[PDB]
């Protein structure tokens, strides 16, 4: 009968417990430094292998009520001719579907599961985790709470879903280089579309500067009332662009002033992104930042999740989908071996290893087309 302490309740965090839950693993407490949970973020990516994670713990038709089954990815060059076009999704050959779908929305989906499922007590909310301990097989947490006071807490296991910024990975690693900087700054939001395509199509293009555009509808609600919430991004050499930002955070305010410069020549004849960015809801900016590859994630009964782990560039399989199979491998992994530290070390020596190899390979690939960019 173990005891587990979850740092975060974002979506590494609440999938976790829920993967915990499913693999029959007891007792589960999640700790969330935000005051009250938000449905904050824009579009993301679940990745067929993720969708069926979730699907086995359960959020198949929730998942169906609000997510976007994308079909399709057409690539489309500058006079907005379909250069490349690829079946996704079902329809090209996985057993479920890849979802598009808006973050916080998929966030309370999750929370909702958590809540109903281990009880309204497992989600204690306003609780940031500042100090960390492992003394005598047990893991000891200073955490702080709303206006102020701090709570001590105990664990068999300290699981850091805790994101970015993860408090866990800074105890673990404390001599880990600041977030790395891909050298592209994003801007990301949401447009109301009455039509967009089918629907279910993603859009991507690039400038002869490599500018790049990924546009893709989101929500179910607003298809199931004949319109589309179109999630796009803006990706642009942050040689272009200056410096922007002090800060990296998932929260972060943009300026249609600044983004709009960068896409004002396109002529897409069918799409025009000028009204997609100006009749935006929401831009938010964000520079695109990793992590470098650890050698290791955990020590004892502490261990990394999520961006906690691995954090990487928000684009394509990254993200979300990561960290739903994290979970799925540590419940199961905990469910396997009984001595705790070694079950620990087996989840991390299954998902370390190549998420190290998307870290470098994704840094790889950054590097070759920007230096395609750059000559004349
Ligand atoms: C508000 C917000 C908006 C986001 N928007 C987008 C987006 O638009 N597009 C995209 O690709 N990704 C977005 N993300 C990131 C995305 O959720 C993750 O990259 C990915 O889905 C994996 O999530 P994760 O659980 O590892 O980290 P996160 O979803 O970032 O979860 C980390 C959680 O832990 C909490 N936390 C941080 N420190 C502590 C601590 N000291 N103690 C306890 N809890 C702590 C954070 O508040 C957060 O809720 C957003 C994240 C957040 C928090």
């Known amino acids: 009968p173990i005891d587990i302490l979850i740092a975060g309740a974002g979506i590494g965090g609440l999938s976790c417990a829920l993967a ?30 993720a969708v ?6 359960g959020l198949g038709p929730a998942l169906a009520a609000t997510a976007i089954p994308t079909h399709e990815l057409r690539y489309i060059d500058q006079s907005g001719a379909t250069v490349w076009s690829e079946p996704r999704g079902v329809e090209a050959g996985n057993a479920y579907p890849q979802y598009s779908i808006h973050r916080g929305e998929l966030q309370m989906i999750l929370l909702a ?3 109903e499922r281990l009880g309204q007590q497992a989600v204690r909310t306003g609780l940031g985790v500042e100090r960390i301990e492992e003394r005598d097989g047990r893991v000891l947490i200073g955490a702080r709470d709303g206006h102020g006071k701090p709570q001590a807490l105990g664990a068999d296991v300290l699981v850091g879903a805790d994101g970015i910024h993860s408090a866990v990975r800074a105890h673990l ?33 690039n400038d002869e500067h490599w500018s790049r555009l990924v546009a893709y509808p989101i929500s179910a609600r607003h298809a ?22 002090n800060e990296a955070d998932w929260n972060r305010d943009g300026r249609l002033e600044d983004v709009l410069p960068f896409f004002a020549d396109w002529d897409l004849g069918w799409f025009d992104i000028r009204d997609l960015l100006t009749r935006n809801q929401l831009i938010l900016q964000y520079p695109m930042v990793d992590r470098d590859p650890l050698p290791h994630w955990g020590r004892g009964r502490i261990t990394l999740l999520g961006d906690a782990a691995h954090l990487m560039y928000p684009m394509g399989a990254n993200g979300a989908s990561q960290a739903i199979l994290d979970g799925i491998e540590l419940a ?16 991390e020596e299954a998902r370390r290893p190549t998420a190290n ?20």
């Open 224 to 245: 199931a009332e004949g319109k589309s919430l179109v999630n796009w991004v803006c990706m642009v050499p942050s040689a272009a662009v200056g410096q922007l930002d």
């Open 113 to 115: 599961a958590v809540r």
């Open 173 to 205: 690693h404390p001599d880990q280089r600041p977030l790395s900087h891909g050298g592209i700054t994003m801007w990301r939001g949401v447009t109301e579309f009455d039509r967009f395509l089918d629907g279910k199509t993603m859009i991507v293009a």
């Open 357 to 376: 190899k998307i870290i470098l390979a994704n840094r790889e690939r950054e590097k070759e087309e920007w230096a395609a960019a750059s000559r004349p």
């Open 20 to 49: 915990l839950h499913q693999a029959g693993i007891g007792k589960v407490t999640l700790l969330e430094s935000s005051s009250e949970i938000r449905p904050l973020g824009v579009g993301i990516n679940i990745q067929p292998a």
């Open 332 to 347: 199961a992994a905990l469910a396997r071996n009984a001595d705790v530290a070694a079950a620990l070390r087996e989840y």
């Open 52 to 57: 069926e994670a979730l699907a086995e713990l």
